[PDB]
Amino acid sequence: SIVTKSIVNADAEARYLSPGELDRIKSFVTSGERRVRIAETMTGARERIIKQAGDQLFGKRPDVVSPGGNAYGADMTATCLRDLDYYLRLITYGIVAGDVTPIEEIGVVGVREMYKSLGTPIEAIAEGVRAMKSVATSLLSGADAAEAGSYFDYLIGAMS
Amino acid sequence: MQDAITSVINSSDVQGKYLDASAIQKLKAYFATGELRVRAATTISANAANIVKEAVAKSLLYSDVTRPGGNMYTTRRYAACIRDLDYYLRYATYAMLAGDPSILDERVLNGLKETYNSLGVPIGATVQAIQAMKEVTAGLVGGGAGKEMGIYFDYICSGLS
Ligand SMILES: *[C@H](C)[C@H]1/C(=C/c2[nH]c(/C=C3N=C(/C=C4\NC(=O)C(CC)=C4C)C(C)=C\3CCC(=O)O)c(CCC(=O)O)c2C)NC(=O)[C@@H]1C
Ligand SMILES: *[C@H](C)[C@H]1/C(=C/c2[nH]c(/C=C3N=C(/C=C4\NC(=O)C(CC)=C4C)C(C)=C\3CCC(=O)O)c(CCC(=O)O)c2C)NC(=O)[C@@H]1C
């Protein structure tokens, strides 16, 4: 989080955090409860979010579920939905941390090499994240929706 | 390094689990103390030099350590020593801010004892000086922050044993 980042930065300069850095951690902690609340709402609706996003995905990209597609078959479709779940999970981690590092370090570095090896069209994964973004933020208030949306966008941009 | 937030995220991740109620209690507990940590960090930062000076005065000055033959003898070694104390104080503050001692294991304690032993830096005296900073610090940040800081001051001392 920004606590780790500020520390690592100050250390690179062999100095104590600056007042500016301290103010950042300050805000970070007071908004902590809001972010935790956002993450909880997404965790609770986990199953519904994956079902609907999955449905919207296969609707936009029937190919992946049709014959010759990477997710053709009850089992491959299941595994595909399993991956969507992995990412929703990472996103709630991101939200509580206040930044994308958990999403990045657990599911983005090497993501292109992993999916290319499995033959999974990464553009379709991104579409699945777009779908989740839609179902997930629809569960939130205008303010929170925008806030959580940014984490989805980061992920979408990292797969495109 | 991990902070109190990422620490909870990693243990959840290794289990492949969404944040638990228990995990959420830990997050909330850190957030509640966040301001306290920032206020302590602020004071310590403003008194860093005086904290080190008093600790040295109280534990190392006017002993065999500073006289010819002592490890703190020669201006180069005296400075190297107060430099180390400045380090322990700065890193203990980081760890207190993060609510986690990992930065200590990774950036401070790794190979420290061996280095000290190699150079002949007395660990017992170094530990005494850190404990003295512990006391001087509590008296500036107050009992609350003082005990938190003490956890990390002790962590370092333990890693030198
Ligand atoms: C769903 C939107 C898309 C889809 C997915 C799909 N994935 C697999 C197989 C795997 N996916 C992973 C994924 C991850 N591992 C990680 O560590 C992370 C980050 C947290 C992710 C996201 C892995 C490891 C596999 C391998 C199987 C395993 O889990 O051991 C499949 C199966 C493909 C196969 O050939 O067996 C599928 C179908 N496929 C699509 O077409 C959608 C676009
Ligand atoms: C002061 C309380 C005691 C003391 C210290 C002393 N230390 C050294 C030399 C080194 N100290 C370190 C320690 C660190 N270096 C770092 O970068 C960090 C941050 C994580 C730490 C904690 C290291 C690596 C050295 C060796 C390299 C260097 O000099 O930079 C000296 C000098 C040793 C010499 O013979 O030149 C001294 C004197 N000495 C005492 O007597 C006190 C008990």
Q: Are A129 and A140 in contact (CB under 8 A)?
A: no
Name the CA dihedral angle for B77, B83, B88, B93, rounded to a multiple of 10 degrees: 170
How many interface pairs between A and B have CB atoms less than 8 angstroms apart? 94
Rg of chain A over all Cα atoms, to the nearest angstrom: 18
Facing residue for B38 by CB, picked from A15, A22, A106 = A22
Instruction: Locate A64 and state its tokens.
Output: 């992946």
Q: Is A7 annotated as a binding residue?
A: no
Instruction: Locate A7 and state its tokens.
Output: 């520390």
Ligand 2 pocket mutation, candidates B121, B133, B155, criterion most atoms within 8 A of CB = B121
B38: containing domain? 1-161
> What b/e sequence results for B15-30 when a residue is b if at least 16 CB atoms lie within 10 Å of its CB, and e otherwise?
eeebbeeebbebbeeb
Nearest to A160 by CA among A129, A118, A119: A129
CATH of residue B111: 1.10.490.20
Percent helix, strand and coil across chain A, each to the nearest 5: 80, 0, 20
Q: Are B27 and A32 in contact (CB under 8 A)?
A: yes
Domains annotated on chain A, with CATH: 1-160 (1.10.490.20)
Percent helix, strand and coil across chain B, each to the nearest 5: 80, 0, 20
What residue in B sits closest to A3 (Cα-Cα)?
B98
Q: Are B160 and B126 in contact (CB under 8 A)?
A: yes
Q: Are B23 and B8 in contact (CB under 8 A)?
A: yes
